[PDB]
């Protein structure tokens, strides 16, 4: 089940408005697995508030830890679900141009095998 | 030199607008080679007009057979050089969600190896 599954638009509205108002300085992102992806392993947790400074390269980092992935495996994080964005891209131009309508910033990730299809 | 290195913006606004006019059936998509890409080669055909009722997975056969590509070979179509979409999307739908400012689709189509190196 997805977020937005599990969460109607108003709740998540909601829950975009509280994360603003306790951590003004993060951005809010939603990841989750590509479905279908197999390989990968789901994540015990899907909102990351991301610190506003950093870039792209900085929340892969964070993504590939808690995935605890091996040295090896390489991956794809894709905005909303198709976009490639380059890692030294603030995070905080891509919430600004690619944020969903309820706040939050959406991603998936997926395998290199999973697309190698 | 792509495409938009050869035709001024004016001149891309018209071509979509006779297309429009001449092809209705039809979506006006510019197809390229990925920058830099060293395992596909350049097609001589860089302007498709797409039936507008087909997915994308059409598309892809198309490209795949103009390459001559087998089964067994990976192909990679992207939009505005950064989109994955899902095969089995309208490309109608394709072209109303990511159009360019000219009202031309543009797409460059990548290899294996090219690919690859857009992990992280």
Redesign the interface.
């Known amino acids: 089940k997805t977020f937005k599954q599990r969460r109607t638009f108003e709740q998540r509205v909601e829950d975009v408005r509280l994360i603003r108002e306790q951590h003004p300085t993060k951005i809010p992102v939603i990841i989750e697995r590509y479905k279908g992806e197999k390989q990968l392993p789901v994540l015990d947790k899907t909102k990351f508030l991301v610190p506003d400074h950093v870039n792209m390269?900085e929340l892969?980092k964070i993504i590939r830890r808690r995935l605890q992935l091996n040295a090896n495996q390489?991956?794809?994080?894709?905005v909303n679900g198709?976009?490639?964005?380059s890692?030294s891209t603030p995070i905080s131009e891509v919430y600004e141009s690619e944020k969903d309508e309820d706040g939050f910033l959406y991603m998936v990730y997926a395998s290199?095998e999973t697309?190698?299809?």
């Open positions: 390269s892969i390489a991956f794809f994080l894709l198709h976009s490639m964005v890692v290199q697309f190698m299809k």
